[PDB]
C-alpha cells in the first residue's frame with residue numbers, strides 16, 4: 001500500500017512581481033505576474049504516500065525538517081490528499097541543486113505522478129499555485145506569465161513564446177549575506193495588502209508594466225525590458241515602506257549592489273536589477289555582457305557571491 | 321552707500337517631513353511639517369548690500385562659492401531685493417558651525433536687519449520660506465510646525481509649546497560617508513509630486529501623523545512620538561521608490577544604521593530614526609539614554625561618525 005512519484009522543477013525569478021493575495025485560501029493573486037525560469041537552480045522531490053506511515057515526514061538536503069520548516073509542504077499535502085480523498089501520511093524527500101517556488105512545484109509534480117492525477121500543464125500549474133503562488137510559474141520554462149484570473153479555475157501560468165530571446169539572456173545572482181531576519185513573503189505581502197498606503201499605487205501600475213514587457217519581448221528590446229522590470233521591482237519594495245509597521249527586505253549589501261548596477265550601466269554595460277523577499281540582488285544581463293558584468297562586480301563581491309544562470313526548462317515528471 | 325546685517329540660525333530636523341511643493345514660485349508646501357531645532361549645528365551669516373559692488377558674491381566657510389553652489393542664495397537675494405526695491409549687489413559671508421535650512425534662515429535674518437524690514441517672527445518665517453521651505457522652521461527653537469496654509473500670507477512656522485519636553489530629548493547623528501550622488505531635495509520632491517504613484521498615500525497620512533505627534537507631546541509619550549515619526553520618515557522615503565525614474569537617498573550605511581536602531585530598541589534602548597535627503601541617519605533618543613546608544617553604535621561606527629545634539633534656540637539677529 002504505497003504510491004510514489006518524482007519531479008524536477010527549476011526556480012523562476014519574477015520580472016513583474018506577484019505581491020499580495022486576493023484570496024488567501026486559494027492563492028488567487030491581486031495582480032498578474034511574469035517570470036523567467038532559470039537553469040542553474042532547481043529542486044528534485046520524491047513523495048511516497050504509504051498506509052504504514054505514522055506521520056508526515058519532510059527531508060530537505062538530507063536534513064529532517066521541523067514543523068515550521070514544513071508548513072507550506074504540510075498545507076500542500078493536506079490539500080492534495082483532500083482532493084484525491086487519500087488518507088495516507090507521506091514522506092517528502094527533496095534535494096536542492098545550486099528554492100520555495102521550485103520546491104513546491106516539484107512537490108506538486110511528484111504528487112501528480114504518485115496519485116495518478118494525470119494533470120495537464122495548466123492544471124498542474126493550478127495545483128502548484130495552491131502550495132505557493134510563485135511555484136505555479138515553475139511548471140513552465142523560459143518566460144512565463146501567471147494570469148491572476150478570478151477563480152481557482154482561471155488562475156494559472158503559461159509559457160510566453162519569445163522567438164528564443166530567453167536563450168540570449170542571463171541572470172547574475174549577487175548573494176548578499178548581511179541581512180536582518182526578514183518577514184516571510186507570505187506574511188509580508190499580507191501585511192502590505194492590508195496596511196500599506198502605497199498598495200493601490202502598486203496595483204495601478206502592474207498591467208501597463210506587463211503590457212510593455214510583452215511589447216519589449218516581441219521586439220527583443222533589452223533596455224526597454226530592463227527599465228520596466230527594474231522599476232517594477234523597486235515599486236514592489238516601496239510598498240513595504242508604507243506598511244504598518246513598515247519594513248524592508250533590503251540589507252546594506254543590497255543597496256551596494258543596486259548602486260553598482262547603476263554604475264555598470266553608466267560604464268556601458270546594459271543590465272538591470274530586481275529583488276524578491278530577501279537581500280539577494282538578481283541582475284538581468286545579455287549573455288554577451290555577462291562576463292564583463294561579473295568582472296566589474298568582482299571589484300566589490302567575492303567570486304562565491306556572483307552566481308550566473310541562463311534560462312531553464314519547465315517541470316519534468318518521473319515514475320519511481 | 322552700504323547696508324549690512326548679521327544673523328545666527330540653528331539647523332532643524334523634520335520629524336514630520338515636508339516633501340513636495342503645492343506652489344513652486346512661493347514655496348507653499350503640499351503638507352504641513354514639524355521639526356526640532358538643534359543646538360549643535362548652526363550658521364552665522366553677514367550680508368552687505370553696497371552700491372559699489374559689481375556682482376553678487378557668496379563666501380561659505382571662507383571659500384568663494386560658484387554659481388551652482390550659490391543658486392538658492394541668489395534666488396533669495398533677488399526676491400528680497402525685489403520686495404525692498406533694492407538695486408544693489410550683495411556680499412554674503414556665511415560660516416557653518418558643527419546646513420541648508422540654517423543657512424537660508426540666517427540669510428533671511430541678516431537681510432531683515434540690513435534692509436530694515438523690521439519683521440515679526442511670523443513674517444521672518446514667511447520670508448525665509450521663500451528661500452527654502454525647511455528654513456522657515458529654523459526661525460524658531462525647540463519644536464516648530466510649518467503650517468502649509470494656502471497662500472504666501474498663510475504659510476509659515478511657529479514654535480510648539482511642549483512644557484520643556486524638548487529639553488529632555490537628543491538627536492544622535494550617524495554620519496554616513498558611502499553615498500551615491502543624490503538628487504537634491506528640491507528636484508527630488510518635485511519629481512515625486514509629479515510622478516510618484518505613492519505620493520497620494522503620503523499625503524493621506526500626514527495630518528493624522530501630525531495630530532498624534534501633538535498628542536504625544538502633550539503627554540510626553542516618547543515611544544509614541546518615536547513610532548509616529550519613524551514611520552513618517554520611512555513613508556517619505558518610500559515615495560521616491562515610486563517616482564519615475566525611481567530613486568533612493570539611502571546608502572548601505574544608512575540601512576546598517578537603521579537596522580542597528582531596531583536592534584537597540586530590542587535591547588532596551590528606546591530610540592527612533594529619521595532621514596532627510598541624504599544618507600545620514602538621525603536618531604531621536606532621550607537624553608538619559610544617549611550615552612548608552614552612542615556606546616552601542618560604536619560597535620559599528622567610529623566616534624567621529626556619532627555626533628550628538630540637543631534642542632536649540634530660534635534665530636538671533638545682530639546689528640553690524
Ligand SMILES: C[C@@](O)(CCOP(=O)(O)OP(=O)(O)O)CC(=O)O
Pocket residue numbers: 013014016017018019027033100131132133134135185186275276277
Ligand atoms: C517577492 C516574490 O518572490 C513573492 C513570492 O511569494 P511566494 O510565492 O513566496 O508566496 P506564497 O504565495 O504565500 O507562497 C515575487 C514573485 O515571485 O512574484
Ligand SMILES: C[C@@](O)(CCOP(=O)(O)OP(=O)(O)O)CC(=O)O
Pocket residue numbers: 333334336337338339347353420451452453454455505506595596597
Ligand atoms: C527631506 C526634507 O529635508 C526636505 C527639505 O527640503 P528643502 O527645504 O531642502 O527644499 P526647498 O524648499 O526646495 O529648499 C524634509 C524636511 O526638512 O521637512
